[PDB]
Amino acid sequence: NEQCSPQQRTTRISGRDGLCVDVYGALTADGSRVILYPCGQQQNQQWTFYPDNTIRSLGKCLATSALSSGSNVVITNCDYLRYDDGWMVSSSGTMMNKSSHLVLTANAATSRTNLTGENNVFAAKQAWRIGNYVEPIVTTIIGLRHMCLEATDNDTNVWLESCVKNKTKQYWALYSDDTIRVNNNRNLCVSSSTDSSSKLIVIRRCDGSINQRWVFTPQGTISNPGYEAVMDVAQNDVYLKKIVLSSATDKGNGQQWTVFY
Amino acid sequence: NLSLSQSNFSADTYKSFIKNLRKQLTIGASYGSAGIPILKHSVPICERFLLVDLTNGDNETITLAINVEDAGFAAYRAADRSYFFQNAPPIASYVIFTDTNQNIMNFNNTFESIEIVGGTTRSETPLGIMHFEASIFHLFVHDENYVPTSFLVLIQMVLEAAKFKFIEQKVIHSIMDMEDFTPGLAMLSLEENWTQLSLQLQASESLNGVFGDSVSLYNSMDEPIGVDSMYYPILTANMAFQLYQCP
Ligand SMILES: *[C@@H]1O[C@H](CO)[C@@H](O[C@@H]2O[C@H](CO)[C@@H](O[C@@H]3O[C@H](CO)[C@@H](O)[C@H](O)[C@@H]3O[C@@H]3OC[C@@H](O)[C@H](O)[C@H]3O)[C@H](O)[C@H]2NC(C)=O)[C@H](O[C@@H]2O[C@@H](C)[C@@H](O)[C@@H](O)[C@@H]2O)[C@H]1NC(C)=O
Ligand SMILES: *[C@@H]1O[C@H](CO)[C@@H](O[C@@H]2O[C@H](CO)[C@@H](O)[C@H](O)[C@H]2NC(C)=O)[C@H](O)[C@H]1NC(C)=O
Ligand SMILES: CC(=O)N[C@@H]1[C@@H](O)[C@@H](O)[C@@H](CO)O[C@@H]1O
Numbered sequence: 001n002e003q004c005s006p007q008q009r010t011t012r013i014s015g016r017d018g019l020c021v022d023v024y025g026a027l028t029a030d031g032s033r034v035i036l037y038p039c040g041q042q043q044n045q046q047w048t049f050y051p052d053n054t055i056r057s058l059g060k061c062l063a064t065s066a067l068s069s070g071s072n073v074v075i076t077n078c079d080y081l082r083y084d085d086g087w088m089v090s091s092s093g094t095m096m097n098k099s100s101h102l103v104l105t106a107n108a109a110t111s112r113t114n115l116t117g118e119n120n121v122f123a124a125k126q127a128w129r130i131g132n133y134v135e136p137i138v139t140t141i142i143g144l145r146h147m148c149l150e151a152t153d154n155d156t157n158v159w160l161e162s163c164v165k166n167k168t169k170q171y172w173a174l175y176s177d178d179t180i181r182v183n184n185n186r187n188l189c190v191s192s193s194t195d196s197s198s199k200l201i202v203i204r205r206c207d208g209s210i211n212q213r214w215v216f217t218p219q220g221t222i223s224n225p226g227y228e229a230v231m232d233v234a235q236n237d238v239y240l241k242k243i244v245l246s247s248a249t250d251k252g253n254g255q256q257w258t259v260f261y
Numbered sequence: 262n263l264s265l266s267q268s269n270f271s272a273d274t275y276k277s278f279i280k281n282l283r284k285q286l287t288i289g290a291s292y293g294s295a296g297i298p299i300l301k302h303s304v305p306i307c308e309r310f311l312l313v314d315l316t317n318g319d320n321e322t323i324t325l326a327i328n329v330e331d332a333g334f335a336a337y338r339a340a341d342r343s344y345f346f347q348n349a350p351p352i353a354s355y356v357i358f359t360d361t362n363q364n365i366m367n368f369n370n371t372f373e374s375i376e377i378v379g380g381t382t383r384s385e386t387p388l389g390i391m392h393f394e395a396s397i398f399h400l401f402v403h404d405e406n407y408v409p410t411s412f413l414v415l416i417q418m419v420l421e422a423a424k425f426k427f428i429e430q431k432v433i434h435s436i437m438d439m440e441d442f443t444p445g446l447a448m449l450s451l452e453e454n455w456t457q458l459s460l461q462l463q464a465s466e467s468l469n470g471v472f473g474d475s476v477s478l479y480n481s482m483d484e485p486i487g488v489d490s491m492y493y494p495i496l497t498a499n500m501a502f503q504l505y506q507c508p
């Protein structure tokens with residue numbers, strides 16, 4: 001089966017706020033930097049993946065420009081990296097330089113932002129959807145007692161309510177930076193607690209933080225990888241109207257969720 | 262045998278049955294990067310079937326043989342009778358429903374084959390609590406005119422729901438709202454692409470989670486979403502097991 005071994009694939013890469021990984025001004029010179037830009041069809045936003053662990057646009061290779069955190073990611077001549085073991089991408093969407101462990105990061109949301117190689121802290125600024133379909137995915141999130149997650153208290157809290165197909169606030173936009181955004185206000189993100197005394201999960205203004213990165217795992221959890229925790233229904237009681245971040249456990253069903261799109 | 266009966270058909274019971282089915286199917290499964298379990302393969306025929314019992318509104322029961330390599334129905338038993346698809350593994354009749362009157366259904370267990378012979382498609386076939394109950398009856402008596410369409414119901418409500426949480430969920434909404442549905446493009450996309458998505462997931466191992474080819478999955482707005490990589494929650498948090506495809 002030769003389809004077990006695909007030779008290459010050209011795709012896009014989206015991430016923070018649904019912007020795309022883009023070679024600034026389609027410049028081809030070695031060390032020409034990479035930025036967030038609004039997604040389109042241009043060749044400078046087209047990234048070809050190969051078995052050699054290279055990722056390429058404009059015939060040149062995506063790469064970090066320094067061992068230390070904080071320097072730009074760039075395209076450079078692929079012949080420079082012939083002795084390098086290249087890039088690695090986790091299930092979560094963390095794109096990591098295999099050698100240095102630095103990760104593709106966007107230190108601001110704003111278009112034309114320089115992408116840098118930073119230390120992985122599992123922040124939403126560091127999550128990426130490799131794929132041509134860069135749009136947010138609109139859906140309901142269904143958990144304990146077949147109930148839906150709903151944005152409440154003027155989009156500040158979140159908890160389970162009975163699923164109603166019409167209900168506007170039960171819809172969520174799954175962005176390419178692993179954020180889970182309020183559907184009709186996509187500046188707001190689902191957020192683990194910022195107050196140390198609370199485990200309550202809430203809704204806040206999207207900031208690219210660790211609190212705001214969520215991974216829908218195949219085992220049916222919504223994981224916050226940075227905090228090594230998962231979304232849970234407080235006391236397995238939907239009527240408490242509290243969703244909290246907990247250590248993965250198989251005690252109840254409160255940590256199990258389904259995406260319905 | 263794992264079981265689902267009409268007398269106790271509730272969202273919770275359905276969800277348990279599907280859950281126990283998945284895990285029963287994934288005993289000794291292999292695992293990739295993606296963490297989606299891959300069904301067993303080159304299994305000895307003696308061990309390749311999982312039996313499941315379905316009991317209808319009358320107190321009457323069928324036992325269905327699921328091929329554990331591909332989560333399809335191979336055959337079923339009603340009382341002292343049993344019925345095999347043409348494309349059941351050729352030795353299957355010597356392993357399952359041994360002590361019964363064995364009949365060959367003159368069609369394959371595939372949707373295409375079932376739809377051609379029954380003259381009726383999935384899109385026009387209702388799914389729901391009472392259809393499932395009736396599909397069990399028609400199989401029990403083996404009303405030839407209703408066998409195909411019955412399989413369309415039951416394959417989808419049992420096996421395809423086990424494959425895809427979306428589909429499971431689609432059946433749960435139906436049980437709770439007490440409303441029948443016919444499968445839209447969303448459901449069909451999944452059913453259509455299970456084997457292809459299995460292949461691309463396993464092939465993507467060597468392209469950093471990127472597929473060799475794209476797969477179009479519809480949402481409930483009929484907008485096609487292209488899945489060309491493992492980084493889509495509508496795949497990763499949906500499809501519960503894969504067909505063995507690649508080493
Ligand atoms: C996103 O990336 C670009 C590309 O790196 C950033 O801009 C560059 O900014 C450098 C400062 O970080 C410029 O270097 C300067 O060059 C002058 C020449 O006289 C020199 O006097 C300065 O000391 C400085 O020196 C560098 O010194 C170290 C050397 O290794 C290096 O070769 C020198 O250049 C650099 O020219 C410029 N590169 C290009 C091609 O644009 C960009 O930084 C932002 O814009 C630049 C132009 C500058 O005005 C910065 O103040 C500003 O941050 C960065 N974008 C952001 C917003 O962070
Ligand atoms: C990943 O990071 C490593 C280390 O920062 C890079 O390896 C360096 O490559 C540069 C340019 O080719 C050389 O000048 C250095 O000597 C290398 N350093 C080490 C420690 O090997 C590597 O290029 C990066 N690769 C990618 C794909 O980003
Ligand atoms: C088509 C083309 O080259 N477009 C690029 C765009 O992708 C982005 O890099 C921009 C930066 O200001 O420069 C150009 O407009």
Ligand SMILES: *[C@@H]1O[C@H](CO)[C@@H](O)[C@H](O)[C@H]1NC(C)=O
Nearest residue numbers: 347348367368369370373374
């Ligand atoms: C059934 O499938 C077999 C392969 O097992 C095949 O060669 C045949 O064409 C199919 N028959 C029908 C009626 O669809």
